[PDB]
Subunit: 151 residues, 6 copies
């Protein structure tokens, strides 16, 4: 009866994201990954699903966007977002306060583990295009697809 | 004989802006709102004028842009800018120092009241388009026009 | 079966604190306020208890300190802390990462509401001693005791 | 009829401080330097007075402390504070919001010039004790007194 | 046998950049300025070369981009980058950590001198287009070319 | 003929420190760890020496303090300092600029590896006293001594 929504573009999902999903999943009864580019919708959904098989209380869903509306529709009142190096925290704070104002939804921030604290969807893609090895920072399902869209 | 310029795009003006205008207006002999998109020039001017009728020592003017040139032309030497959650303060500081360097103009920053600290022109528009209620964060003259550009 | 610990000195508890307690209480099955100076232990406990009567799933407890040990003893794995203006977030982040490292405990941060975002136990006391009125920022049970320790 | 108060310990006054005093003095009808340690009260007053002879509309006064009370007594509603490298801006912002809450007083922040942006009373003293030359960062009246309290 | 790479777009090179180049050049055996828009490639190369004649151990080179690959090819293991007001340090830190992860390359940050701390290629161009005088913040070779692309 | 000084209290030295020492040692001809409390001087020296046997070009020395004087005496012109989570970077920047002003010495900052980014001498001691296991974050020579000063 407790629930958190984890919203993002997830293009593609990274290990920093999965770290947060695991932590949300361990603290709330249900977690919903809301997928709000390099990969299309079902590729992103599939990559999230394939990377979260170990989390039975998590589900993935496309969202169309006011995150607070999505949260409110799912019957929840909490958003969970990760923090990593390069997160624009002032903007996240502005959105958190706006979201509480308009829909009464709370946002809980949690720091990603240090080893995954410097990956982001954008940087991983940019580095990947130029032949940098980011495979230790992304799930296998993502590495698999990233390799294909190279050769 | 004292004067401050409050520069911005004001697309649209928010209650965070009007809060700063009121504070400038109470500390300087004259305030000039310099309007430097969703709304066109006179819509923005009209919304600022309609939202500042209670400030007889404030006037609104379109500006074409080096803010310091505008300030210097008006016979003033001070810029007043607000700070809110999500303000890029490092960039504002860079511009403040550049502005002092090139024209000797000082920039005074003042924090918007907490209740209006999370609204910004951009976020208010984006939330408004998606049916979020931001009317408590914007002046009536703006809410009025925002409603029309919806229906 | 879900639970969060809200740790602090609470000397005295403020409305920013109670705001966070309410949000924790609404998202977790049990909340434990861990009280880790101007007021002594039971005064602090009493002020927290008196200010949280509307939260049946919250309890107050003195803690002796590694917060993670307290959390682990209570059968929980989550800490919830508020953020306000003046919070030393880099230090909170350092502690959050250390806490995850040593005991696997997650820390969730949530922003206090804007109206209570500038109060802190320290500043409220310092302002109170000098005759400033901070009563709108503190619970009645605290205002009551603060008045007495004045006259 | 406009006025700003510039509060601080000024132990001792630095060129970063005098830079702000000059900018306040040029934008307001009256400026009051409120002196709220290495030097005693009149040494600090004397050093401020000696360093501001070129500012006829500035006066120096000892203050006993809620700054807002001092401001309100002088008939003003504005505080002006400088920002330099190492300023704890989050704490200054917390105090600015508290000050507006309790007495309706506004606080205007202005960045000190780059050349004086790294001096602070504390660092100048600590460096001076260890024989570092900080004379280009402090007024002559201060350098004069600092030399004596060395030999 | 020690070496640092200083990467950037340098469009155009500023005195903040040359300050960092000088400091790198004084601490490492070789410095390579890697040029990764208003000016084309050889204009940028020429402006860097003309502004660094006093640095015999510095050379300029176009780079095609993973900076770490460029560094590794030159036989070095260090990147040197400047910090100025408005630098997005969190993003630089994210890239520094990613760069160490993928290629084992270290990044050393050094603060530009205060007098050049507020210039950036972008701001200098934008100010220059609008007739602001930024000549004290840019090398003569750049001022010379900037003047021409005006008249 | 190149050299960096790494200054600090090192009470005790941590793996975040040794990470920086290794990176300095790999980029400069000589590194000098300047030791400027829980452990006394030779305990700290011994712990640094024992933790740096793999760095032949590093030496340890007690310093008496203006760091810039120490640097200048050793014949060097560079300070190398690490950044970790909780570092007061604004204060480090203020000192870096002051140090350049008074002695022309440059300060290069480098980010500690993510896995050691949350340890600090202070936090490691405080956690250690309360029975937290920080052994993965400190060198064996330190863990050895920390164990003894427990039993
Ligand atoms: O927009 C996005 O996809 C990023 C938003 N986000 C959500 C969870 C999470 C965890 C770490 C870093 C960023 C995160
Ligand atoms: O570009 C803009 O319009 C914003 C610039 N600005 C000017 C006054 C003010 C008050 C609060 C927040 C931002 C503000
Ligand atoms: O040490 C303390 O008491 C403050 C720690 N803390 C815990 C909850 C909370 C909410 C807002 C601000 C600070 C808070
Ligand atoms: O407490 C203090 O004395 C510092 C407060 N302060 C007041 C004016 C000013 C200018 C630059 C830097 C700090 C300043
Ligand atoms: O992208 C760029 O060109 C800026 C990157 N950069 C490199 C050296 C340097 C010095 C001061 C400021 C920025 C700097
Ligand atoms: O005062 C101190 O000992 C810390 C100063 N310091 C020097 C190197 C280093 C590396 C990581 C973190 C802090 C560091």
């Amino acid at each position: 009866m407790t629930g958190a929504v984890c919203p993002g573009s997830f293009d593609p999902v990274t290990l920093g994201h999965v770290d947060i999903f695991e932590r949300a999943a361990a603290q709330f009864d249900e977690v919903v990954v809301a997928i709000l580019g390099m990969f299309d919708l079902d590729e992103r959904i599939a990559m999230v699903k394939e990377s979260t098989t170990h989390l039975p209380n998590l589900r993935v869903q496309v969202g169309h966007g006011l995150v607070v509306d999505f949260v409110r529709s799912c019957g929840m009142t909490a958003i969970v977002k990760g923090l990593r190096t390069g997160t624009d925290f002032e903007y996240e704070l502005q959105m958190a306060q706006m979201n509480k104002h308009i829909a009464g939804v709370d946002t809980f921030f949690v720091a990603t583990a240090p080893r995954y604290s410097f990956v982001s969807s954008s940087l991983a893609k940019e580095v990947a295009m130029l032949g940098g090895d980011v495979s230790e920072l992304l799930p296998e399902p993502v590495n698999r697809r990233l390799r294909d869209r190279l050769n």
